[PDB]
Structures are given as C-alpha cells and as structure tokens.
C-alpha cells in the first residue's frame, strides 16, 4: 500500500552522551552531598563496577539509553586517614593498601569537608599527638584551629569544652610534653579570662621538679624575693630567671608583669 516512510535526522550527541565514567575520578571525588554527577550512558553490566568503585554514592538512572549519575550519600573516611592531614580530601583503597592517586580496581573513600572545623578529629588526634607519633605541624595546627572552631553550632562548642577538659587533665600531669606546651601557648594567645585561668591551673598543678626546672621566674628563692624589694620595677623586668624562662610556663601574673618593663624607645630591656 506504499507507506510514506521517512528517516529521522542523524543524531547529534550531547556532552552528557559522550561522558565516560572511567575517566571521571577527579570529577566524582570532589562531589558533595545532594549533588548529581552525570557520568553518561552506562552499560548494564558495568553498574556493579561503578557502585563498588564509589560506595559512598548512589547510582541513579537519570535518563534513557542508560544515562546515569552519581549522588553522594555518605563520607566513609576513617579518623586515622582523614585527621592526620589537612590537605587530603580522599583516598583510594586497593588490595589492602591506601593510595592518594586513583587506580583501576580501587575504592574511593572521602573525608568530611568539615572534619577539622568540628570535633570529629579530637579523639583520634588527642591520642596520636601524644608520644612518638607527635607531628609538630599537624598537632599545633589542630590545637590552634580548635580555638577558632568554625562550628559555632552548640555541639561544635560542646566538643571544644570536652577537649579543653581532657587537655586540662592531661597537662596537669606533665605540661612539658609537646602537645601540652602547644596547648599552653594557644591559651596564652587566646587572651581571655577563661584561658588565663586554665593556664594558672595547669601550671600550679605541676610537680616540684617541674617548678624547680621551668618555673623559677614564678617561684623565686628567698634571697631573690628579698633582693627585688630594693627596686621599684617588678622583679620580672631584671630577674635573669625571667629573661631565661620558657614563656609558655609563666604564670599569668608573671607574663603580664613582663610587659611593664618600660622600654627606652629602642632597646630598653
């Protein structure tokens, strides 16, 4: 009956139709929650290969022809792999090894972007920053960032209060250990009535050996104290024990008295 046939125009694929998920590890890894990452058409036999590579994401069939997208649902990064660095946002797991770069057959695992803006790393770094695993850079930056914690949410503060109590108990035993000296210094730079209160509390709890060794500017001898009464200026302005003292182990009173020494414009000592 001679039908009037007509062929459709030749197809012109879009950028989405040319997407190859096997080339998109640097596109999918920085994705955040609630964000769809289109990965182009995906054969049915390759869905398990994609879902195992990105267990944190949900594979969603968005359109015809197998058009798919990945939607981040979780962050599975662990504390030892996310907390001891401020630059690594993700890593790849393959054959029991952890790598920074992608490799075929590896499994993506990502860190929370706010892992160092909250207290999600306080427990791991409280232990890791003690003893032989102490990294001075990472641990000082961890304690310092706690004082300016972006999570002003009342739970971000409560984690801050919990860390200060743990550091207070720890540093009362020995304030010479490097993470405690870092804590004392950041309390000094915070310059509040609470932080100064905690400084004096920690320093007064130290042993007689600690005070004999580090705090002789705070606890002068009998003859040193009697001698200082003959001078109008505070003792801390001329006492060699105060010019040789570790500023992190000074009582708040001695630290304030050091800034009252009347410098003659230039070098006044």
């Amino acid at each position: 009956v001679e039908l009037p046939k007509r062929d459709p125009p030749p197809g012109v694929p879009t950028d989405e139709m040319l997407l190859n998920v096997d080339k998109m590890h640097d596109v999918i890894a920085p994705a955040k929650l609630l964000e769809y990452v289109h990965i182009g058409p995906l054969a049915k036999d390759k869905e398990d290969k994609v879902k195992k590579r990105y267990p944190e994401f949900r594979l969603v069939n968005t359109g015809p022809g197998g058009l798919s997208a990945l939607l981040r649902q979780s962050y599975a990064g662990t504390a030892p792999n996310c907390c001891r660095t401020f630059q690594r946002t993700h890593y790849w797991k393959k054959d029991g090894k952890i790598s920074d770069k992608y490799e075929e057959g590896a499994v993506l695992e990502s860190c929370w972007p706010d892992v160092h803006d909250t207290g999600k790393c306080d427990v791991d770094l409280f232990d890791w920053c003690q003893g032989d695993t102490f990294d001075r850079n990472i641990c000082h930056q961890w304690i310092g960032s706690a004082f300016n914690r972006a999570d002003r949410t009342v739970e971000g503060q409560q984690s801050l209060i919990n860390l200060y109590n743990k550091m207070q108990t720890l540093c009362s035993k020995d304030a010479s250990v490097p993470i405690c000296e870092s804590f004392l210094h950041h309390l000094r730079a915070h310059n509040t009535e609470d932080s100064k209160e905690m400084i004096d509390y920690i320093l007064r709890q130290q042993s007689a050996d600690f005070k004999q060794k580090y705090m002789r500017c705070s606890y002068p001898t009998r003859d040193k104290l009697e001698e200082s009464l003959k001078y109008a200026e505070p003792r801390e302005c001329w006492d060699p024990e105060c010019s040789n003292a570790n500023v992190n182990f000074l009582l708040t009173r001695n630290y304030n008295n050091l800034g009252l020494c009347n410098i003659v414009r230039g070098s006044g000592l």
Epitope: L229, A232, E233, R253, L260
Partner: nanobody
Framework: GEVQLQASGGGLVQPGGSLRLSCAAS????????MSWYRQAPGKQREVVAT???????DYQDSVEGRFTISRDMAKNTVYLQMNSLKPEDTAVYFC????????????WGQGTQVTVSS
C-alpha cells in the same frame, strides 16, 4: 615621726579558713612606695610573703602563691592581704612594710597583727 603602718585583720582560724589582713598607711603614699607583707614565726627570722609595686605589679613567696593575694586601694591608701586555705605553718605575726621608689633610706616597718591556725 608619724609614719603609721598599723596591721589588723588577724585572728585564730581552723586550717582551711580565711582571713583578710589590712594596713591603712599614713604619712606614705602608695603611688610612690612598694608595699610588702612580712611575717615572722616565733623564734624565726622574718620573711616577705607578698609585695606590690608602686605600679601595681604583685609578687608572692612560693609557699603562699595562689593562696594569698595582695591588693591595694589608692583612694583609701590601704593595702590588703587576702589569705585563703590557711595552713598551720602560716602561724606568725604579719606586719606591713613600705619602701620608697628610689630613696633607699626611706623604709618603714609596721606594727604587726597575730595570725594563728590550729585546731
């Protein structure tokens, strides 16, 4: 004559109590003298316990640091010694002391008050 540094506020308290010593100075101005609180146990030499400069910077003996606090009122020209957590070894006669800033001979010693701690 007439440089008065009378110390008061003493008493007998149990260990752990509290006392606020007082010393209202006359003939001497605090904004020009260093005030020091001394004590002398029976049959012992006197020792400085606290001190405050003419600028207000304080300093203490180690055995009383954190427990005692020396303050001053410029209007009232009176220097205080807040004594907290009194230990039995605090038992002594506490008295005032005034020393001129750059005049070494202008030192004066006050009349003491009794502080006893026991049960």
């Amino acid at each position: 004559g007439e440089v008065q540094l009378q110390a008061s506020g003493g008493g007998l308290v149990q260990p752990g109590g509290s006392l606020r010593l007082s010393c209202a100075a006359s003939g001497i101005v605090f904004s020009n003298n260093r005030m020091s609180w001394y004590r002398q146990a029976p049959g012992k030499q006197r020792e400085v316990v606290a001190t405050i400069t003419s600028g207000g910077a304080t300093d203490y003996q180690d055995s009383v640091e954190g427990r005692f606090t020396i303050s001053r009122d410029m209007a009232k020209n009176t220097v205080y010694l807040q004594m907290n957590s009194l230990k039995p070894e605090d038992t002594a006669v506490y008295f005032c002391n005034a020393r001129r800033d750059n005049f070494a001979t202008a030192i004066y010693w006050g009349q003491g008050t009794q502080v006893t701690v026991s049960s």
